[PDB]
Design a protein around this nucleic acid. Structure first.
Lengths: 50, 105, 204, 136, 100
RNA sequence: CGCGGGGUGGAGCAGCCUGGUAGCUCGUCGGGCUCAUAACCCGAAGGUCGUCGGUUCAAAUCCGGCCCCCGCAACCA
RNA sequence: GAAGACAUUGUCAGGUGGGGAGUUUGGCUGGGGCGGCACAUCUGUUAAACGAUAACGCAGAUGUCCUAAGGGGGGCUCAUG
RNA sequence: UUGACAUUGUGAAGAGACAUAGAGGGUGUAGAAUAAGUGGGAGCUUCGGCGCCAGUGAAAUACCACUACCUUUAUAGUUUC
């Protein structure tokens, strides 16, 4: 026989992420001393569109 | 097919070798198990990749088998091998052929 | 082995406080089946008695009617078939012959319930009466498989010895390993307990 | 473990007897295979042998030992002067070691008639037609 | 679904902005073009029935027939898994689905 | 064939473990009830409980053989 | 920190397993296929009065039954009118 | 994918389970009587509880071992979860 659509995507060549216009990972921060004892203030400056 | 459960005939049993009495029965298949040379011989070539090494048989065209009689002599312990000819229904007890019966009920 | 201390050897002829004869019972243990072809029959050969005073319903004529008075109990004949049809059941183990196999069709109306008829279960109808009478008054009980698998009889009374009660359960034990097929189990001689009526039971 | 055959998706192409993937024993032990891998890192030294020390369930541990065929202390001495010879160039890569002559079957016996002087050498030898100028 | 975790994991108060996005028809595939032109390559999309036998276990034939059930077994080959694997029921739903 | 289940009025099923009495419906005849028909309830005709042997104070039932049908399974002339 | 000295990995056995591997998928024959069995066999005929002798020729038929429908002895005569 | 063996060591608690020790309770007619129930028995006991040779049923009963089929019925010696 041949190969199907999902068996082909296992390599991930064109089936991958088109990431470029992304300003990074929208993660958080590492939970430390301040984040589990009181707090800390973060100031938002710009809110663009991903 | 009806036959006797006993029959007199020639039995070359050394001390005998004349007409005696044998209590007739039937030959059973037995048991194959292991120890057979072909058993180890077969599962030698059979062990591993390749699947089936020797042929089978799916060409069964026969419907009947030859019934063998296993009658042992009540004098010298020796059993006898007597076969007949392919049948369907079989027996050896009673219900022999009676003189004159009808088709009642 | 069995000839040592107990089972049905010597330690029972002392714990008896009764005036009557207290007979023992042979109760063995071995796993069998529920078929009639996988069951063992035959009667045991005992050289010693059981010390019993039971009454038999004997009846012989000809050359077996004079010896049927020294080995037997009561003098009965063949013409006696009109009397055995009313109410008498004082018969535990009887004895007939081949001289009375033709009028044995008149002993089933009042004597087929408790089995006082010569059929094919207990060896009773035979023309021999001088050798088998050391097994009637010298008691020779039967070995027949009941609902399951067991044979209950009597060895003897606890008023004999250990020289006589040692050659009774050693020769009867030869039919308890011989007539045994393979439709049964292991240990044809295991947990063997025996009691009389008064004195307790001792295992083996 | 074993030596799974490098087949794409499990594609071998042949007789069923010639289609093994998991049940590939590989005629060499891990003791012999370990010596040859270190014979590639320290390929400048003449490897000797090794021995099984520890184990767990996934890894087999072996202790390796070699010598310096350039160091004067080893180049001399009539005890191990044979190691400094060209014929002793990476004895393990072939199987001239103790464990290599066990996996190859280099032994004396009626149990080693197919490997007396060489596995395939004996094969070639027996199958060759020795024809004299005067055919006997 | 509901899953019990540890009272240590963080989380930002409130809901995210952008409710009602995919809640509007894209109308033309010219914009569906630009959609995956940013995400990843998986579009366009071809039908298994319209394909050949070699291409897909649902392809091959003359009509729009399947041949076998689109229901796959949870323990099947990675070459036979292309449909409704391990479905607890199919067809048109006669309920507000959800959970228990 | 290695194993297991079922077979009961013309139809289709109980009862089996823990043996003594054949329960039910549809098909049929007849009755009761209403002013009468329909529906309903009930009596009876209707089952060698497929075949052989046996145990038992007594076997459709419990054990062993055989027939008819189905399922799992084994499959080296 | 989370699980946990379980899962995990190695090694065997039951299974699932056209995803994929390898291979096969009668003959005779008024083309082939479909239908059949003139393939293992027997009766009469074909068959030309030794023997020999084909057709998808004809009329037919078997793959079993029977401790007796068998073997021996003794007696007897049947269908039909 | 499921079981198994090694990796895989330590402690606790419970549930099943084979061996023991032990106990209990189970058809209609019927005989002043609850009965799967085999054998012996005419006394065990200070009372008499029953007996009993006998007897209705289809089988019997105080003095008690056993065949004992069984009971979501006990030890805490094995084994498993």
């Amino acid at each position: 026989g041949r190969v199907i659509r999902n068996q082909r995507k296992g390599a991930g060549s064109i089936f991958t992420s088109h990431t470029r216009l992304r300003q990074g990972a929208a993660k958080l921060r590492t939970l430390d001393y301040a984040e589990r004892h009181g707090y800390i203030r973060g100031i938002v400056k710009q809110i663009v569109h991903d | 097919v009806n036959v006797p459960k006993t029959r007199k005939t020639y039995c070359k049993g050394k001390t005998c070798r004349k007409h005696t009495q044998h209590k007739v029965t039937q030959y059973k298949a037995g048991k194959a198990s292991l120890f057979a040379q072909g058993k180890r011989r077969y599962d030698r070539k059979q062990s591993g990749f390749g699947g089936q090494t020797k042929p089978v048989f799916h060409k069964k065209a026969k419907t009947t088998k030859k019934v063998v009689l296993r009658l042992e002599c009540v004098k010298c312990k020796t059993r006898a091998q007597l076969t007949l000819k392919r049948c369907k229904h079989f027996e050896l007890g009673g219900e022999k052929k009676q003189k004159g019966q009808a088709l009642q009920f | 082995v069995k000839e040592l201390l107990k089972y049905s050897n010597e330690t029972k002829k002392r714990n008896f406080l009764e005036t009557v004869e207290l007979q023992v019972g042979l109760k063995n243990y071995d796993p069998q089946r529920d078929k009639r072809f996988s069951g063992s029959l035959k009667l045991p050969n005992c050289p010693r008695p059981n010390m019993s005073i039971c009454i038999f319903g004997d009846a012989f004529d000809v050359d077996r009617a004079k010896s049927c008075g020294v080995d037997a109990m009561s003098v009965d004949d063949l013409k006696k078939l009109n009397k055995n049809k009313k109410l008498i059941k004082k018969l535990s183990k009887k004895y007939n012959a081949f001289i009375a196999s033709e009028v044995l069709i008149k002993q089933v109306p009042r004597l087929l319930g408790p089995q006082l008829s010569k059929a094919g279960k207990f060896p009773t109808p035979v023309s021999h009466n001088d050798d088998l009478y050391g097994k009637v008054t010298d008691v020779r009980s039967t070995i027949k498989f009941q609902l399951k698998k067991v044979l209950c009889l009597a060895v003897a009374v606890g008023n004999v010895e250990m020289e006589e009660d040692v050659l009774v359960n050693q020769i009867l034990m030869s039919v308890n390993f011989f007539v045994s097929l393979l439709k049964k189990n292991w240990q044809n001689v295991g947990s063997l307990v025996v009691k009389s009526s008064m004195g307790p039971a001792f295992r083996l | 473990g074993n030596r799974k055959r490098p087949v794409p998706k499990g594609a071998t192409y042949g007789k069923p007897t010639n289609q093994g993937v998991n049940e590939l024993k590989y005629q060499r032990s891990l003791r012999a295979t370990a010596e040859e891998r270190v014979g590639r890192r320290a390929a400048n030294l003449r490897v000797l042998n090794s021995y099984w020390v520890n184990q767990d369930s996934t890894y087999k541990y072996f202790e390796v030992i070699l010598v310096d065929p350039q160091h004067k202390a080893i180049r001399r001495d009539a005890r191990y002067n044979w190691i400094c010879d060209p014929v002793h160039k990476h004895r393990e890569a072939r199987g001239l070691t103790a464990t290599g002559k066990k996996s190859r079957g280099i032994n004396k016996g009626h149990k080693f008639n197919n490997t007396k002087a060489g596995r395939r050498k004996t094969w070639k030898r027996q199958n060759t037609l020795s024809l004299w100028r005067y055919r006997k | 679904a509901k899953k019990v975790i540890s009272s240590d994991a963080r989380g930002v108060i409130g809901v995210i902005a952008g409710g009602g996005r995919v809640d509007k028809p894209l109308l033309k595939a010219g914009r569906a073009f630009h959609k995956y032109r940013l995400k990843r390559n998986s579009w366009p999309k071809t039908r298994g029935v319209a394909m050949n036998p070699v291409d897909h276990p649902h392809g091959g034939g003359n009509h729009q027939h399947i041949g076998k059930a689109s229901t796959i077994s949870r323990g099947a080959v990675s070459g036979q898994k292309a449909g409704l694997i391990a479905a607890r029921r199919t067809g048109l739903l006669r309920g507000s689905q959800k959970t228990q």
